[PDB]
Amino acid sequence: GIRSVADRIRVRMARLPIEGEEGKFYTLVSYVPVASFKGLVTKTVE
Amino acid sequence: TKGTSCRGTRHNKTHILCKRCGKRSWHLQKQRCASCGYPDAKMRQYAWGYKALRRRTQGTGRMRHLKIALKR
Amino acid sequence: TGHKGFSYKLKLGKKIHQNRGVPQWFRMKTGNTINYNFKRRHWNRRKMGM
Amino acid sequence: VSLKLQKRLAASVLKCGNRKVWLDPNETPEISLANSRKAIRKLIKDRLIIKKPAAMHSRARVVERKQAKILGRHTGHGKRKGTKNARTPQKTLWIIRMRVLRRLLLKYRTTGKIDKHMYHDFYLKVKGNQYKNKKALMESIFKALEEKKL
RNA sequence: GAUUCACGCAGUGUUAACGUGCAAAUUACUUGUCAUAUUUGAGUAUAGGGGCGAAAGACUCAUCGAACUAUCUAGUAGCUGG
RNA sequence: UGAAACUGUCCUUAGUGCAGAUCUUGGUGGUAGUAGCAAAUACUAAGAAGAGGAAAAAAACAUCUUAGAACUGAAGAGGAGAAAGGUUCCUAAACAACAUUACUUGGAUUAGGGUGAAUCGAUCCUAAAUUACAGAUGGAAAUCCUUAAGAAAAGGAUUGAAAGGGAAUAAGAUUAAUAGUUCUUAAUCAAGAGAAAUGGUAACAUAUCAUGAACUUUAAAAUGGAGUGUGAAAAUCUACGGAAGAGUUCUCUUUUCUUCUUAACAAAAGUAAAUUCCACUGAAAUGAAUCAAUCAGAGAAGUGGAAUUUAUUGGCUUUGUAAGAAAUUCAAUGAAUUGUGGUAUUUUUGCAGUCUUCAUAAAAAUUAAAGGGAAUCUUUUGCUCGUACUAAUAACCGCAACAGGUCUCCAAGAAGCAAAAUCUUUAGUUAAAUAGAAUAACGCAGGUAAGGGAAGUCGGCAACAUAGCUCUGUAAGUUAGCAAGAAAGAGUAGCUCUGGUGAUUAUCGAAUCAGAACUUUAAAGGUUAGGGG
RNA sequence: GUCAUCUAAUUAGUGACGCGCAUGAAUGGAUCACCGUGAUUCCCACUGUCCCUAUCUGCAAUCUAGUGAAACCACAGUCAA
RNA sequence: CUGUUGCUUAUAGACGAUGGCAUCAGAAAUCGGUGUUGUAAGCUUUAGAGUUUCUUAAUCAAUACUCUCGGGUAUUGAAUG
């Protein structure tokens, strides 16, 4: 609902080229569901 | 409540269009026209209402036949 | 109202017919000052009182 | 574009509300050409316009509470909010009881257990609130009969 | 023409809000009342020294200890202003 | 600068000189980019269209679709009418102005389209009341009279209701918008055209039958309210049996949800409740019956009959209409299914008796019957007018898209005594006088607080406090009816069980009451909900 | 007003007294049971009314983008005598 | 040099201002410390008052035992790396 959000959220954002203009980029934030947040650090997904 | 609130029920016409003068002055319950003095045979005219005379009288309309006769 | 007399309905129709602007060709006449109809009205602006 | 006309026309054809109408978001150009009910009827056949299912409203919780109330699991003193006469009307209890007792008396008279004279006496006793229930009347009738035969 | 709740309605209090307002009298809570002396729609009747009033000089189109509108009328002013 | 009239002197004439009149009319400042653009819970992501989200976060972005999250909560922010409005209705193009920002949106601009009736209403009848010729009155305008005054009208003239009376139509489909109005199918009504009957003891009964004038009478149209019981239909709930589809499914769930329908008008397999009458008989040892009553020798109860009412024929199931429609699925137009019940609740509609009035709770048009005996199936047509839309937190009245006001119909689940508060389904909407950041004072709205407890104050103003149901208990005073829910005290949860209250003749069914072990965070209190003396 | 009572304390309330400025009998006199969004006093309970203020939330106010009035105004705006 | 700007910056603050750092900058996770509440979800204790179907097998069952000093939260204006 509008009155509550999860205490911690794990997301993954990817920088991708804009289809129209080749020069510019855009960020796509996606949601990564995890069972527990213990021992998770900032990982560069490749 | 003599001001804004009391004007809610104003949805019953008192005067409707008259048949001899065409104005919305025919009193429904009184069965008379307040302006041209309907069924009364004579047109209702008063000397205190000098303006009401110059608003509807001879020469304020088409004068369909009288214009021919006087010019004749 | 949904219910109306025949004569009253026709007088309603004329008021609809008279609520029109000046045709374009009449506006191009030489020495023409009649550009807009100042007798115009709209339902939500002035009640025609009939 | 504005698919307001197609949203309204689809509901009229599908006989639902505008809330249940589904318009394909990928086929906006196709639906936009549909400006008539005949065209809309063609789109439904092609499944571009779909009638959404009604929201599910389950009575499982209500049913399982009724069975608990049948066994008396929730009919306590802290769960009653109306008066005794409100919950069980006293007049209707008398109406039911009068029908029950008078039915039995009529059955005994026509069967032959009791004659008209003793039936008449028991009729006024019943009306006078002498017997609590059906059981109380049968022993009272049985007692009177054996006294008569004694 | 008993006691209460509800749909509604009123206007006891906060002398609360607002007071160049949502509103030329309204809003919130509290209070009262909520079918027979009840509530209510349409039709109809009663007109200004008149009507109507379970009576407050109250109401009679935001106008009432005498409505609105026009004529007498540029009413008169030993009084104020220019 | 301006581009066509004007000036100097003498007499004459006057609408002849402005800083004020809260002067009149018009225009314009400071205040001032200030006060404001804060009731109605609320928006977010992706995409489309567009000049109209750009960017060193310019943190906000109108319309449409999808998804998420929500509100009105079925006495509605739903679906429709009366009045009032009058084209605001539908569509397309277009956004200069208007809806306190903006708008590609609009109840705003421009141009087109749109209202179909023999059966719905007006039209017909009369109510309160209203208005004529003649007559009477008046100086006059005019007033009175409404059948009394009349050489007028068998008997009394006009108007007065889109809520009173009233001949006759329904289901499905169709339009961008009209539909008891159009189309398909199926009906109904009115006006027209082609010495005179039987049956039953009786109440009374017979696809038109089976004659019935003048005149007269009776009835219908056409009659308050309250409360109780009950018949039937619909909705909701539920029992058994299924068919199709959908949701959940690593934890379970033979699972949870949806569909399983039927009109006007007629028919008469089967079968009801209530009331009133008819025949046989004659009741006391008085009986018959209702929740209550109430009834009987001017005749009870019993048995056998007749009639009327129960949303059209004749009330319900059933039948024709009619499954060929419609609903739910499946395949790519064609295929499948469409049982039977309930001693449950509400609503609607009738019926039966009871209570109440110093209240007795309309008329006519129009129809039928009687008393009397004067006379000797097919087919045609059905005219005039209204019909769009809102009916309101944006179409009505208040200067307006104003938190004010304005008459009605239909009405799901939970929980509860309750149409109460609170939450949800069908439907509607997420916008309704702009937002973003920061989180000072002073506010408006909602709160809490140690110890004390009205010492504050004109005054317990405001707020706190009591609050449902069951049981025990209840004073003085009194018009003997009341006070009284007086006051005061105890109980209340969850789970596992036990017993009482019936129907039918072993099977089935109802929520209601009482009682007992065990457990815990020890129980009306989320909401609703008396402070007492 | 005087005497009692209510309180620690009573121009308040209640019960009495009465030569009552100027009460009094359908201008109705005396009496009160039930009733009252009527006026007045006292108890219990409860509490931010108060000792004596602290603190929490929403909407504003503050700043900004867009939009944007009004009352008022002789000229104006530091004091003492 | 100074100001703007950045740390959605603090020992500051209505806005300005004031204070600190600005590539050995900053920000964020995670980990440890430190707090708050009271023993997570799944399975097991004739647990468990009793019931049913069996015919000592199961099933239902408020609550309750061990795993569990557990689980969850913890700067947002907390302290380390």
Side-chain angles (χ1 to χ4, degrees):
Chain A
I2 201 173
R3 279 200 183 78
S4 173
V5 194
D7 271 319
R8 274 179 246 277
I9 305 159
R10 177 101 154 152
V11 317
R12 158 199 318 185
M13 48 219 181
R15 205 194 294 157
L16 309 173
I18 295 180
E19 328 307 343
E21 39 260 67
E22 300 198 348
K24 285 102 193 185
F25 285 113
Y26 88 102
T27 312
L28 167 77
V29 192
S30 154
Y31 170 64
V32 183
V34 317
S36 87
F37 292 87
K38 312 285 185 167
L40 278 187
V41 289
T42 315
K43 291 163 187 71
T44 292
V45 161
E46 164 55 69
Chain B
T1 73
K2 51 162 109 162
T4 307
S5 284
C6 91
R7 324 230 177 283
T9 41
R10 307 182 64 254
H11 59 87
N12 286 310
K13 289 167 172 157
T14 292
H15 295 104
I16 63 152
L17 293 183
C18 180
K19 191 199 210 180
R20 190 163 81 181
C21 36
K23 290 176 72 164
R24 190 180 95 173
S25 300
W26 171 266
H27 199 309
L28 282 167
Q29 284 189 260
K30 273 190 204 193
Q31 289 175 91
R32 91 180 316 274
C33 181
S35 198
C36 55
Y38 204 7
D40 313 309
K42 307 204 179 191
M43 282 280 200
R44 163 190 176 272
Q45 296 170 115
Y46 287 113
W48 51 261
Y50 66 102
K51 283 206 195 194
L53 283 143
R54 72 161 82 128
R55 294 208 254 271
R56 176 183 57 228
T57 183
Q58 201 193 77
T60 49
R62 200 209 273 226
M63 263 180 98
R64 181 182 337 203
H65 150 79
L66 195 55
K67 100 215 298 173
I68 296 156
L70 294 200
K71 156 248 221 176
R72 164 133 60 96
Chain C
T1 30
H3 310 119
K4 39 186 77 95
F6 173 55
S7 313
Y8 183 51
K9 181 187 143 164
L10 290 209
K11 300 193 168 31
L12 291 184
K14 188 170 182 69
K15 293 321 195 68
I16 275 184
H17 185 63
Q18 297 185 334
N19 208 25
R20 296 174 94 142
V22 198
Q24 184 62 34
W25 58 269
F26 196 91
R27 269 213 274 192
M28 251 85 85
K29 269 170 170 229
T30 58
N32 200 238
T33 323
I34 310 171
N35 295 295
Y36 309 115
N37 198 357
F38 56 75
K39 293 199 192 190
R40 267 189 118 173
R41 45 148 260 280
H42 211 38
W43 62 280
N44 59 336
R45 285 292 147 244
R46 181 194 81 87
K47 307 310 194 169
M48 44 192 222
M50 150 183 34
Chain D
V1 317
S2 162
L3 299 190
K4 255 193 63 84
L5 169 73
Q6 285 78 23
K7 193 85 146 189
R8 165 170 75 74
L9 281 186
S12 182
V13 176
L14 292 165
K15 297 155 143 173
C16 66
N18 293 19
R19 40 211 308 272
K20 293 313 191 224
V21 177
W22 185 83
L23 307 173
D24 199 310
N26 302 323
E27 300 314 278
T28 306
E30 182 32 288
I31 300 164
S32 82
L33 279 316
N35 47 69
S36 80
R37 286 158 172 277
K38 186 211 287 333
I40 285 283
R41 272 186 230 113
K42 207 253 179 153
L43 282 200
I44 294 158
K45 180 226 184 214
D46 312 339
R47 291 198 77 73
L48 282 205
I49 301 178
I50 273 176
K51 181 172 157 148
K52 291 195 210 147
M56 255 166 86
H57 205 188
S58 166
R59 278 185 64 87
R61 302 194 331 118
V62 179
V63 157
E64 93 184 25
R65 240 205 316 277
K66 293 291 210 167
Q67 326 277 41
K69 265 187 207 154
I70 283 288
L71 311 185
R73 291 300 185 282
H74 300 287
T75 84
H77 266 298
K79 299 271 144 181
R80 295 164 183 166
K81 296 297 181 323
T83 56
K84 200 204 269 283
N85 180 279
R87 300 178 62 103
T88 150
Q90 197 187 18
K91 174 177 174 85
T92 59
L93 283 173
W94 177 261
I95 298 179
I96 297 166
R97 185 218 288 196
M98 278 294 125
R99 267 154 204 171
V100 162
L101 296 183
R102 283 173 197 172
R103 244 202 315 269
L104 173 81
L105 283 169
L106 181 75
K107 194 195 62 129
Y108 280 172
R109 205 201 53 216
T110 181
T111 278
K113 294 183 87 271
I114 66 187
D115 54 69
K116 55 145 98 153
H117 314 282
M118 164 207 306
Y119 163 81
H120 188 74
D121 279 7
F122 275 130
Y123 199 99
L124 302 176
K125 261 161 209 178
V126 159
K127 175 164 154 57
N129 185 30
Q130 189 86 29
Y131 317 108
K132 309 190 287 90
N133 36 33
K134 202 199 190 196
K135 151 185 77 181
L137 182 45
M138 307 164 115
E139 291 54 357
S140 298
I141 282 169
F142 145 85
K143 202 181 72 58
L145 273 170
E146 64 57 28
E147 205 140 356
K148 163 138 186 80
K149 91 180 182 61
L150 270 183

